[PDB]
Scaffold this active site. Structure first.
Site, PDB file in Angstrom:
ATOM      1  N   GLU A  69       5.266  -3.741  13.282  1.00 43.59           N
ATOM      2  CA  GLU A  69       5.807  -3.040  12.298  1.00 43.59           C
ATOM      3  C   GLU A  69       7.555  -3.269  12.659  1.00 43.59           C
ATOM      4  O   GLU A  69       8.570  -3.279  11.727  1.00 43.59           O
ATOM      5  CB  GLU A  69       5.610  -1.614  11.770  1.00 43.59           C
ATOM      6  N   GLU A  99      -3.046  -7.848  -2.260  1.00 47.91           N
ATOM      7  CA  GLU A  99      -4.586  -7.350  -2.268  1.00 47.91           C
ATOM      8  C   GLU A  99      -4.928  -6.392  -3.291  1.00 47.91           C
ATOM      9  O   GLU A  99      -3.959  -5.514  -3.433  1.00 47.91           O
ATOM     10  CB  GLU A  99      -4.853  -7.188  -0.930  1.00 47.91           C
ATOM     11  N   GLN A 118       0.864  -1.283   0.000  1.00 43.83           N
ATOM     12  CA  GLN A 118      -0.027  -0.105  -0.025  1.00 43.83           C
ATOM     13  C   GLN A 118       0.881   1.261  -0.151  1.00 43.83           C
ATOM     14  O   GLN A 118       0.595   2.247  -0.788  1.00 43.83           O
ATOM     15  CB  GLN A 118      -1.102   0.186   1.269  1.00 43.83           C
ATOM     16  N   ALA A 119       1.931   1.360   0.949  1.00 41.24           N
ATOM     17  CA  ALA A 119       2.594   2.616   0.998  1.00 41.24           C
ATOM     18  C   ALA A 119       3.546   2.706  -0.441  1.00 41.24           C
ATOM     19  O   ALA A 119       3.732   3.791  -0.695  1.00 41.24           O
ATOM     20  CB  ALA A 119       3.564   2.437   1.941  1.00 41.24           C
ATOM     21  N   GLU A 138      26.002   5.927 -10.054  1.00 42.69           N
ATOM     22  CA  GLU A 138      26.716   7.140  -9.589  1.00 42.69           C
ATOM     23  C   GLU A 138      26.155   7.515  -8.225  1.00 42.69           C
ATOM     24  O   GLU A 138      26.668   8.122  -7.434  1.00 42.69           O
ATOM     25  CB  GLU A 138      26.583   8.488 -10.572  1.00 42.69           C
TER      26      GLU A 138
HETATM   27  N1  GTP Z   1       4.029   7.925   3.817  1.00 45.62           N
HETATM   28  C1  GTP Z   1       3.237   6.754   3.642  1.00 45.62           C
HETATM   29  N2  GTP Z   1       3.349   5.846   4.817  1.00 45.62           N
HETATM   30  C2  GTP Z   1       2.306   4.868   4.284  1.00 45.62           C
HETATM   31  C3  GTP Z   1       1.333   4.708   3.297  1.00 45.62           C
HETATM   32  N3  GTP Z   1       0.534   3.888   3.339  1.00 45.62           N
HETATM   33  C4  GTP Z   1       1.086   2.893   4.313  1.00 45.62           C
HETATM   34  N4  GTP Z   1       2.065   3.570   4.787  1.00 45.62           N
HETATM   35  C5  GTP Z   1       2.891   3.076   5.973  1.00 45.62           C
HETATM   36  O1  GTP Z   1       3.232   1.788   5.868  1.00 45.62           O
HETATM   37  C6  GTP Z   1       3.050   0.974   6.939  1.00 45.62           C
HETATM   38  C7  GTP Z   1       2.136  -0.068   6.851  1.00 45.62           C
HETATM   39  O2  GTP Z   1       2.435  -0.823   5.744  1.00 45.62           O
HETATM   40  P1  GTP Z   1       1.507  -1.043   4.304  1.00 45.62           P
HETATM   41  O3  GTP Z   1       2.253  -0.534   3.009  1.00 45.62           O
HETATM   42  O4  GTP Z   1       0.165  -0.189   4.565  1.00 45.62           O
HETATM   43  O5  GTP Z   1       1.148  -2.617   4.436  1.00 45.62           O
HETATM   44  P2  GTP Z   1       1.353  -3.501   3.133  1.00 45.62           P
HETATM   45  O6  GTP Z   1       2.665  -3.206   2.433  1.00 45.62           O
HETATM   46  O7  GTP Z   1       0.108  -2.997   2.055  1.00 45.62           O
HETATM   47  O8  GTP Z   1       1.361  -4.831   3.526  1.00 45.62           O
HETATM   48  P3  GTP Z   1       0.283  -5.479   4.377  1.00 45.62           P
HETATM   49  O9  GTP Z   1       0.644  -5.318   5.749  1.00 45.62           O
HETATM   50  O10 GTP Z   1      -0.004  -6.871   4.397  1.00 45.62           O
HETATM   51  O11 GTP Z   1      -1.146  -4.790   3.986  1.00 45.62           O
HETATM   52  C8  GTP Z   1       2.400   2.040   8.128  1.00 45.62           C
HETATM   53  O12 GTP Z   1       3.636   2.306   9.067  1.00 45.62           O
HETATM   54  C9  GTP Z   1       2.175   3.174   7.560  1.00 45.62           C
HETATM   55  O13 GTP Z   1       2.286   4.381   7.971  1.00 45.62           O
HETATM   56  C10 GTP Z   1       1.282   6.093   2.523  1.00 45.62           C
HETATM   57  O14 GTP Z   1       0.631   6.223   1.591  1.00 45.62           O
HETATM   58  N5  GTP Z   1       2.107   7.028   2.698  1.00 45.62           N
HETATM   59 MG    MG Z   2      -1.863  -3.927   2.654  1.00 44.60          MG
END
Ligand code: GTP
Ligand code: MG
Ligand code: ACP
Ligand code: GDP
Ligand code: LO9
Ligand code: CA
Ligand code: CA
Ligand code: CA
Ligand code: MG
Lengths: 426, 437, 54, 310
Positions: free
Chosen positions: B183, B71, B11-12, B254
């Site tokens: 985390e 997902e 997601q991130a 680089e």
């Molecule tokens: N800066 C920023 N951080 C995000 C974002 N989405 C999630 N995070 C961070 O990512 C962490 C959670 O990981 P996710 O990327 O949401 O989870 P995932 O990679 O989809 O994997 P799953 O846990 O299985 O859903 C948290 O610490 C959030 O603060 C975003 O859009 N921007």
């Molecule tokens: Mg996720």
């Protein structure tokens, strides 16, 4: 497209389960006929978690109604939203369980469990990706207690990689049907410790105390008790049903709330609990303070007598999320001794814009506290009082059980109490 | 022209990638439909922007990107967003069960089922490359997919593309916008497995972005969109040297040469300035001296730490906008007389400076104000080890009781991988101490 | 204070300023560890189904 | 209600500060490893500065400046005083020192041989951060087999009657705003032997008026405030927590010598000083007033002299 299969078993399971479906259907804009008439995009975005879609833009709850006697399920079919349920998903017998765990689990319920698993299979086979199951039942009776745990064990056998979640109503002498309730509850807790990932402990003692002391109801009825359960069940499933910054499912809840596999018994909490003042506006600090107050806990356990392992808070309604995070951090910093130091940042708060019916804003509390041992100690004491004299055991040995199965159930629950006390002093 | 392939995991990584590619299209004048009116070579070309965009015969400029998530709900927004026409469905890869915040699930259980599909789609992008430099991997540390599947992918990329470079943009976990208690576990597990596969990794701490959004943009409760708008600006000023005509950091190699003398110490600290609120109508444009001095205020760093109590191995100043070399050297000459800038004895006390005259692009209607000049400082300072020390401490608190470990062993992980991962982090903290202390 | 490597172009400019001079696992090994975790998953599930069959 | 943690049980100063904080009813002491604190009365060694200022919704304050050891370690103070452009230009108030590793071995002997050549006073004291004082450089270098070799004040100011040597201890509080507060009360530790052993300022001032026709403020305290200001302003860009995610204050103990010409010399700076028994109550209350309550306010002259700086 992660679907949840809902199962309600027994009188109590079908009564709180039916109220749950009335409540969340209203929140999602679904009339009793199954037609959507809401006005928000948030209502339908994650509607598939709990509802199937039949032709004609109808929404059918993915719910399975089970009982060993047809009485309570006829009340559901005649009830308000009784026409919204899939007719094939009514699985009922005729004999009943006689408030007997052995009849539910071994004799009467084994006869009916196969046709329930057939209905579970048909719903699961049409799931794009099944999350798992949520079960509503009581632990003091026979069908929900005995047959419910038999279902959970058999469902796990066929779906070992899916989450099992239960809303389990604990018995209390304050709201008691039969004296054998400590027997049925102790046998069920044994099954729950082994075969569920997440159990919401809904203590009828707490529900009665809230109605009597807080809501000022001299003679609480089950409807009054179920008004709190409907409200709590709406709140704890908010983050599964609505889109937000933190979208939850049954597995993410278990991973983050359960640090050790057996300690998966949660204290629910809800605010406001207002006696009919229902127009008065509650502030965010007030919701936060009441939400952690023991008078708002639904498990009859004083949290200040234990420590919090993990906490999930959900605020509903239009409010300042800045102020919500302020108040939640303030409660943690004020009472830092009640949160374990070996789980950093063990409180997570989520916000949903849609408040429940009849409330401008609310707050729901999902806590995994070591104080929940008080609930199991109470049951264990009531159990031992009778079992030391083998009182009322003939109802169970007459169904094929022997005493050793009782001795093992009490031993496993005492271990659960000791395990909670262990991490309370860690 | 040498191509760069971007990979967004979890997601991130996906939501950040969507913000970065929107900003890229605004900077290069690429419309949401993929068309680029300024591009006169229809259906081809070896320009600088072709490092990130290929071209179809109809003139559509397609990102060299692949979005992967266990997902479908987050990547579905890409299929529906303003820039849906930018990508073709093969670039968007989704699974059924996500990792449920569980590294073991993203890496072993569910990632193994989808790793071949992802590699095949990346190969399809690599085949269109006349000379691939390598990959840019965007992911979170805390997410089950961002940690679990990324480390599996980074392992497989080192196998299938051994001579290629791999840079990371990593979201360090912050409790104020976190989603899981585990985390810290996922962060350390993915760092241990990815360490020897990443050539350079840019850590962005959500805590720093959150507080910069609060104090400089006057945002009460920053949401992901607020954070990603700021992160996209920082990522853009880092990748600008690969997408525009220049001479500094023009290829992924680089980045390692200029910033990573020691392979394990490959986490440069990013500092960005100025961050001005768009609601602020009356804005006084900061000078070259002022924005360069802001590069040494810890409140402007993407990870909160104190570079004064550390040592610099390398420093790079990336200016966008109305900046002239003379102004930089006058700012540096003033800053060295005042600030505490300690370099290691085996490195020259100096700065590699890059200037692109094009000022930063802001998303229209966004929270960030358009400025005349901005700078991103990439400095490999030992002070960033503070972030590892905090993270390892949170790991040690939960692991001392084995809390939540059963969810990982339940997916086939072994308890020993935890201690093996922690020992590596203990060695990494020692490597930083031996360099700067 | 020395400015070296000054490269200019239409898009921008880059240089370096100096102040003080100084004083992989194969696919087979990966596949074995992934299949090892799957074996431990299957073993733990088999013990579960065996317990449930009892 | 504010929260604080105690991580140095041996600190007599902050054991009293902790006693005063609880006596206000608005401070609550947590377990030493509870991260959800406002104030940290931290440990002298390996204080986890990297973990401060990262708890959401908490303003965190620590009783130590990170990097202040450069001033409180004898070798570091000598190198700092020798290499800092803001100090090395003057240092007329700091005795000639040399950092000798068990290196300025050649530079020490160069100035040493000059003193024996000119038959000047050639007594040097060697110490670390076990002490030897000798007039032969051979005995000094062999004694240290990191140490510093400092010139031993051969002509100290001797109190009468008694022909006794003394030093002056001044307590300096630096708050989170880097205000420099000099406690109005110092102590003079008498040697009690010809060249409880504590003389306070009121008596010392009276002696200087009676014996030397001058005042403590004019003859000594101006130089003291000058040295305190020079040392702390020198490192301010290196330790200040003005725009940092956590804030720092710290109590320092400065040690001075006075020669027979009423010239003040700096000896050492103490990062973890104790106080005089009579002065514990007043100073610890001032620490709560100007260093702790300034950040965390609670629901009149000053015992400190504010050394003014830009
Ligand atoms: N800066 C920023 N951080 C995000 C974002 N989405 C999630 N995070 C961070 O990512 C962490 C959670 O990981 P996710 O990327 O949401 O989870 P995932 O990679 O989809 O994997 P799953 O846990 O299985 O859903 C948290 O610490 C959030 O603060 C975003 O859009 N921007
Ligand atoms: Mg996720
Ligand atoms: N250059 C010098 N000339 C004269 N006396 C000196 C001196 N250096 C040290 N001394 C003597 O030693 C004392 C301070 O030395 P030192 O720095 O070792 O104190 P210390 O750290 O051992 C204990 P404290 O920290 O309580 O002062 C002075 O008060 C003085 O008596
Ligand atoms: N809260 C609540 N508790 C109930 C309800 N109905 C029964 N109970 C409780 O459940 C126990 C009786 O179990 P019951 O569900 O009637 O038995 P079953 O039908 O065989 O499963 C007793 O402890 C009752 O107090 C209800 O509607 N609400
Ligand atoms: C917040 O509401 C929730 C949360 C969830 C997931 N969860 C529970 C958590 C408990 C502590 C910490 C610390 N950092 O993250 C978390 C948590 C995330 C599931 C849910 O489903 C019913 C409702
Ligand atoms: Ca029968
Ligand atoms: Ca072209
Ligand atoms: Ca490699
Ligand atoms: Mg009944």
């Amino acid at each position: 497209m992660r679907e949840i299969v809902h199962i309600q078993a027994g009188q109590c399971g079908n009564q709180i389960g039916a109220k749950f479906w009335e409540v969340i259907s209203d929140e999602h804009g679904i009339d009793p006929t199954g037609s959507y008439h809401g006005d928000s995009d948030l209502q339908l975005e994650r509607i598939n978690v709990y509802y199937n879609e039949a032709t004609g833009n109808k929404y059918v709850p993915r719910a399975i109604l089970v009982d060993l006697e047809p009485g309570t399920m006829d009340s559901v079919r005649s009830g308000p939203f009784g026409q919204i349920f899939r007719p094939d998903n009514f699985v009922f017998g005729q004999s009943g369980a006689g408030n007997n765990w052995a009849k539910g689990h071994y004799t009467e319920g084994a006869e009916l469990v196969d046709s329930v698993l057939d209905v579970v299979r048909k719903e699961s086979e049409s799931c794009d990706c099944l999350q798992g199951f949520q079960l509503t039942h009581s632990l003091g009776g026979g069908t929900g207690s005995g047959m419910g745990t038999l279902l959970i064990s058999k469902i796990r056998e066929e779906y070992p990689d899916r989450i099992m979640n239960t809303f389990s109503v604990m018995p209390s002498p304050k709201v008691s049907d039969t004296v054998v309730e400590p027997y049925n509850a102790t046998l069920s807790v044994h099954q729950l410790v082994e075969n569920t990932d997440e159990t919401y402990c809904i203590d009828n003692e707490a529900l009665y105390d809230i109605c009597f002391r807080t809501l000022k109801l001299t003679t609480p009825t089950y409807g009054d008790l179920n008004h709190l359960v409907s409200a709590t069940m709406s709140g704890v499933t908010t983050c599964l049903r609505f889109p937000g910054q933190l979208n939850a499912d049954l597995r993410k809840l278990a991973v983050n709330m359960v640090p050790f596999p057996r300690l998966h018994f949660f204290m629910p909490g809800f605010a406001p609990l207002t006696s009919r003042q229902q127009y008065r506006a509650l502030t965010v600090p007030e919701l936060t303070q009441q939400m952690f107050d023991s008078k708002n806990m639904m498990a009859a356990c004083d949290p200040r007598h234990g420590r919090y392992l993990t906490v999930a808070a959900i605020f509903r309604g239009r409010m300042s999320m800045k102020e919500v995070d302020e108040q939640m951090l303030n409660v943690q910093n004020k009472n830092s001794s009640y949160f374990v130091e070996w789980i950093p940042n063990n409180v997570k708060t989520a916000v949903c814009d849609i408040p429940p019916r009849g409330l401008k804003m609310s707050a729901t509390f999902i806590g995994n506290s070591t104080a929940i041992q008080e609930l199991f100690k109470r049951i264990s004491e009531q159990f031992t009082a009778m079992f030391r004299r083998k009182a009322f055991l003939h109802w169970y040995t007459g169904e094929g059980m022997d005493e050793m199965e009782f001795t093992e159930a009490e031993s496993n629950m005492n271990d659960l109490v000791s395990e909670y006390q262990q991490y309370q002093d860690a | 022209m040498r191509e760069c392939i971007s990979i967004h995991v979890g997601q991130a990584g996906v939501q950040i990638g969507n913000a970065c590619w929107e900003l890229y299209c605004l900077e290069h004048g690429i419309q949401p439909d993929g068309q680029m009116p300024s591009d006169k070579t229809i259906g081809g070309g070896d320009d600088s922007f072709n490092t990130f965009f290929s071209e179809t015969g109809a003139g559509k400029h397609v990102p060299r990107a692949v979005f992967v998530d266990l997902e479908p709900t987050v990547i579905d927004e890409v299929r529906t967003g303003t820039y849906r026409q930018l990508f073709h469905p093969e670039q968007l890869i989704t699974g059924k069960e996500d990792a449920a915040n569980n590294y073991a699930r993203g890496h072993y259980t569910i990632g193994k089922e989808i790793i071949d599909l992802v590699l095949d789609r990346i190969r399809k992008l690599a085949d269109q490359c006349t000379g691939l430099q390598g990959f840019l991997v965007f992911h979170s540390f805390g997410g089950g997919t961002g940690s679990g599947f990324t480390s599996l992918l980074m392992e497989r990329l080192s196998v299938d593309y051994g001579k290629k470079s791999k840079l990371e943009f990593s979201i360090y976990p912050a409790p104020q916008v976190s989603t899981a208690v585990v985390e810290p576990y996922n962060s350390i597990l993915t760092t241990h497995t990815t360490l020897e596969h990443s050539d350079c990794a840019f850590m962005v701490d959500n805590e720093a972005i959150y507080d910069i959004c609060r104090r400089n943009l006057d945002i009460e409760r920053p949401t992901y969109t607020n954070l990603n708008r700021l992160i996209s600006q920082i990522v853009s000023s880092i990748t600008a040297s690969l997408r525009f005509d220049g001479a500094l950091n023009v290829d992924l190699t680089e980045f390692q040469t200029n910033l990573v003398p020691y392979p394990r110490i490959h986490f440069p600290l990013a500092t960005y300035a100025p961050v001005i609120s768009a609601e602020k109508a009356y804005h006084e444009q900061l000078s070259v001296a002022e924005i360069t001095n802001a590069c040494f205020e810890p409140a402007n760093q993407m990870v909160k730490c104190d570079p004064r109590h550390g040592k610099y191995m390398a420093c790079c100043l990336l200016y966008r906008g109305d900046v002239v070399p003379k102004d930089v050297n006058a700012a540096i000459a003033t800053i060295k007389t005042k600030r505490s800038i300690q370099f290691v004895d085996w490195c020259p006390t100096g700065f590699k400076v890059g200037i692109n005259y094009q000022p930063p692009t802001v998303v229209p209607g966004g929270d960030l104000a358009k400025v005349q000049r901005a700078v991103c400082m990439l400095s490999n300072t030992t002070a960033i080890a503070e972030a590892w020390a905090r993270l390892d401490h949170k790991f040690d608190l939960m692991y001392a009781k084995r809390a939540f470990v059963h969810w990982y062993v339940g997916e086939g992980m072994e308890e020993g991988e935890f201690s093996e991962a922690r020992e590596d982090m203990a060695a990494l903290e020692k490597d930083y101490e031996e360099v700067g202390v | 204070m020395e400015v070296i490597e000054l490269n200019k172009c239409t898009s921008g400019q880059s240089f370096e300023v100096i102040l003080k001079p100084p004083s992989d696992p194969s696919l087979e090994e990966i596949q074995k560890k992934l299949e090892a975790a799957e074996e431990r998953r299957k073993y733990q599930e088999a013990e579960l189904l065996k317990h449930l069959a009892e | 209600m504010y929260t604080f943690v105690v991580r140095d049980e041996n600190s007599s100063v902050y054991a009293e500060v902790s006693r005063l904080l609880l006596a206000t009813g608005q401070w609550k002491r947590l377990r030493k490893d509870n991260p959800r604190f406002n104030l940290m009365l931290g440990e002298r060694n390996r204080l986890p500065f990297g973990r401060l200022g990262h708890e959401p919704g908490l303003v965190q304050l620590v009783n130590y400046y990170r990097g202040a050891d450069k001033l409180c370690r004898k070798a570091s103070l000598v190198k700092l005083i020798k290499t800092s452009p803001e100090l090395s230009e003057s240092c007329t108030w700091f005795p000639e020192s040399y950092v000798i590793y068990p290196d300025e071995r050649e530079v020490f002997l160069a100035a040493y041989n000059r003193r024996r050549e000119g038959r000047e006073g050639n007594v040097w004291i060697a110490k670390s951060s076990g002490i030897l004082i000798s007039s032969e450089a051979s005995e000094l270098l062999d004694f240290i087999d990191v140490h510093v070799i400092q010139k031993y004040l051969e002509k100290p100011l001797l109190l009468e009657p008694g022909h006794r040597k003394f030093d002056i201890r001044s307590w300096v509080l630096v708050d989170h705003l880097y205000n420099i507060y000099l406690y109005r009360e110092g102590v003079l530790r008498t040697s009690s032997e010809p060249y409880g052993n504590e003389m306070f300022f009121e008596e010392f001032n009276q002696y200087l008026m009676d014996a030397l026709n001058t005042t403590l403020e004019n003859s000594i305290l101006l130089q003291i405030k000058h040295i305190i200001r020079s040392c702390l302003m020198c490192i301010e860009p290196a330790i200040s927590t003005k725009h940092l995610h956590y804030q720092s204050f710290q109590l320092f103990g400065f040690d001075f010598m006075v020669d027979e010409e009423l010239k003040v010399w700096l000896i050492e700076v103490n990062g973890a000083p104790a106080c005089a028994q009579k002065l514990y109550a007043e100073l610890c209350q001032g620490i709560v007033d100007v260093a702790i309550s300034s950040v965390f306010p609670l629901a009149p002259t000053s015992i400190f002299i504010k050394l003014h700086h830009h």
